[PDB]
Design a protein around this ligand. Structure first.
Ligand SMILES: [Zn+2]
Length: 193
C-alpha cells in the first residue's frame, strides 16, 4: 500500500496548519495532539507547506487519501455513489475523487493505471514574498459518515513532494475527518485525551 512514513528530505519538508480553535463556527480545525484535521464537507482546507530550502523548479505537490485501519489499507478511498453522481464538479475534478484543490488552474488529477489509487497534484510555488510557507486550499468532497464511501473509517491524507519527473522529494501525512461540526468533534476526541 502507499507509504505514509514522514520524510522531510533534503529540503526539510514539514506540514503546518492554521491554529483555529474549536468554536462552533469553525469550518476547519487541526488537532496537534491527534495530528488530525477536522473539516466540513467541501469547505476550504488550507494546508501549509514548510521547507528549509526551496525545492528545484518543476516540483509538484501531490495529495492522496488512504484508510488508516490496517484492515482497510488496500481499499481505495473514493466518494460515495451518491456524491459522484452529484452536480458539484468544478469542471476539473473527476466526480469520484475525495480530494480536490481549489483556486489553481494548473491542477491535475490522476487515477493510477496499476494501483487505482486517486491523487490530485499541483505545481509547487515558493512562499509569497514576506511569508515563510506556501498554502494549498484542499476540499474534501465526501463526509466521513457517507454510508456508501468512507462509511466512518478514519482516513489519512498523504502530502508528497516530487520533482518534475515524479521522484519523491518529501512526504508528510495527517489524519482527517470530514464532519458537520469540526469544532465539536475535535474537542470531543481530545476529551478522550
Ligand atoms: Zn458522500
Amino acid at each position: 500500500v502507499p507509504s505514509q512514513k514522514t520524510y522531510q528530505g533534503s529540503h526539510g519538508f514539514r506540514l503546518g496548519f492554521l491554529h483555529s480553535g474549536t468554536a462552533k463556527s469553525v469550518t476547519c480545525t487541526y488537532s496537534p495532539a491527534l495530528n488530525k484535521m477536522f473539516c466540513q464537507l467541501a469547505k476550504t482546507c488550507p494546508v501549509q507547506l514548510w521547507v528549509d530550502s526551496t525545492p528545484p523548479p518543476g516540483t509538484r505537490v501531490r495529495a492522496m487519501a488512504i484508510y488508516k485501519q490496517s484492515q482497510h489499507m488496500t481499499e481505495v478511498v473514493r466518494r460515495c455513489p451518491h456524491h459522484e453522481r452529484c452536480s458539484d464538479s468544478d469542471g476539473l475534478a473527476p466526480p469520484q475523487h475525495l480530494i480536490r484543490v481549489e483556486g489553481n488552474l494548473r491542477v491535475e488529477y490522476l487515477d493510477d493505471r496499476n494501483t487505482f489509487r486517486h491523487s490530485v497534484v499541483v505545481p509547487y510555488e515558493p512562499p509569497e514574498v514576506g511569508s515563510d510557507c506556501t498554502t494549498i486550499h484542499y476540499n474534501y468532497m465526501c463526509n466521513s459518515s457517507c454510508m456508501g464511501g468512507m462509511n466512518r473509517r478514519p482516513i489519512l491524507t498523504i502530502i508528497t513532494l516530487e520533482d518534475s519527473s515524479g521522484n519523491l522529494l518529501g512526504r508528510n501525512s495527517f489524519e482527517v475527518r470530514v464532519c458537520a461540526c469540526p469544532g465539536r468533534d475535535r474537542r470531543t476526541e481530545e476529551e478522550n485525551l
